Amino acid sequence: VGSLNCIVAVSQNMGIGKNGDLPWPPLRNEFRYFQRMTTTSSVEGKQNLVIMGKKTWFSIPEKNRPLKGRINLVLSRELKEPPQGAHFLSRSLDDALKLTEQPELANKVDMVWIVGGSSVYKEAMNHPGHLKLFVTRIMQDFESDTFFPEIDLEKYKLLPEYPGVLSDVQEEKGIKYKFEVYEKND
Numbered sequence: 001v002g003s004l005n006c007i008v009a010v011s012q013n014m015g016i017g018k019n020g021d022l023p024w025p026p027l028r029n030e031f032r033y034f035q036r037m038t039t040t041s042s043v044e045g046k047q048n049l050v051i052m053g054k055k056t057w058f059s060i061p062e063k064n065r066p067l068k069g070r071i072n073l074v075l076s077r078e079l080k081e082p083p084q085g086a087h088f089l090s091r092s093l094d095d096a097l098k099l100t101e102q103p104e105l106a107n108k109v110d111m112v113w114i115v116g117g118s119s120v121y122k123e124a125m126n127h128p129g130h131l132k133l134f135v136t137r138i139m140q141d142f143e144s145d146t147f148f149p150e151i152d153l154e155k156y157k158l159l160p161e162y163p164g165v166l167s168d169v170q171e172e173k174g175i176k177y178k179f180e181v182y183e184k185n186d
C-alpha cells in the first residue's frame with residue numbers, strides 16, 4: 001500500500017562503495033538524512049521497511065544493526081535464515097515486495113526503501129510503478145569498486161524542489177554534496 005523509494009549517496013564518477021564501506025569518510029548529517037528519510041512513516045503506528053543486499057547489511061556497523069525504528073529485510077539466495085539481527089530474508093526483490101503485502105507485514109509497513117547495493121538498485125529502478133530516487137550527489141570523484149547504475153534521465157525527472165529536503169549545497173569534511181529527488185510515474 002505504501003510508496004516505493006530508493007535512497008543512495010553517489011560520487012561524480014557514480015561510485016557508492018569501496019572495500020566494503022563508503023568511498024568517502026563519514027558525513028554525519030548526510031547519514032542523519034538517510035536515517036530521517038528511511039525512518040519517517042507517513043502513517044501513525046506503522047514503520048517503513050528497508051530492503052538491502054547481503055553485503056550492504058554487513059557494511060552497516062554492527063552496533064547499528066538492525067537499523068532502529070525500521071523493519072530490516074535482507075536479500076540473499078544463499079542464506080537459510082536472515083543474518084543475526086535482521087527481521088526478514090527474501091530471495092528476490094519481487095518476493096520481498098510480495099511479503100510486504102501479506103498479512104504479517106500489511107498492517108505493519110508503510111514505505112519501502114531500497115538501500116542498495118548495485119543489483120537491487122538497478123532492478124528497483126526499472127520495476128514498473130511509481131518510484132522515487134533520493135540521490136545524494138557527492139560532488140567529487142572517489143575511487144570506488146561498487147557503482148550506482150546509470151539513471152535514465154528521460155525515464156526519471158528531477159524534482160526542482162521536494163518537501164522535507166534541503167536544496168542548497170551542503171558540505172562536511174571538505175566534501176560538498178546536494179540532495180536530489182527523481183521520480184517516474186509508471
Ligand SMILES: NC(=O)c1ccc[n+]([C@@H]2O[C@H](COP(=O)([O-])OP(=O)(O)OC[C@H]3O[C@@H](n4cnc5c(N)ncnc54)[C@H](OP(=O)(O)O)[C@@H]3O)[C@@H](O)[C@H]2O)c1
Nearest residue numbers: 008009016017020021053054055056075076077116117118
Ligand atoms: N553509497 C551508498 O548509498 C551505499 C548504499 C548501499 C551500499 N553501499 C556500499 O556498496 C557496497 C555493498 O553493495 P554491493 O552492490 O557490493 O552488494 P549488495 O547488493 O548489498 O550485496 C550483494 C549480495 O546480496 C545478495 N543479493 C543482492 N541482490 C539480490 C537479489 N535481488 N536477490 C537475492 N539476493 C540478492 C547476494 O547474496 P547471496 O550470494 O547470499 O545470494 C549478493 O551477493 C558496500 O561497499 C557498501 O558500503 C553504499
Ligand SMILES: Nc1nc(=O)c2nc(CNc3ccc(C(=O)N[C@@H](CCC(=O)O)C(=O)O)cc3)cnc2[nH]1
Nearest residue numbers: 007008009031032034035059060061064115116136
Ligand atoms: N543517502 C544515503 N547515504 C548513505 O550513506 C547510504 N548508505 C547506504 C548503505 N550504508 C549504510 C551504512 C550505515 C548506515 C547507518 O549506520 N545508519 C544508521 C545511523 C545513521 C546515523 O548515525 O546518522 C541509521 O539509523 O540509519 C546506513 C546505511 C545506503 N543508502 C545510503 N543513502
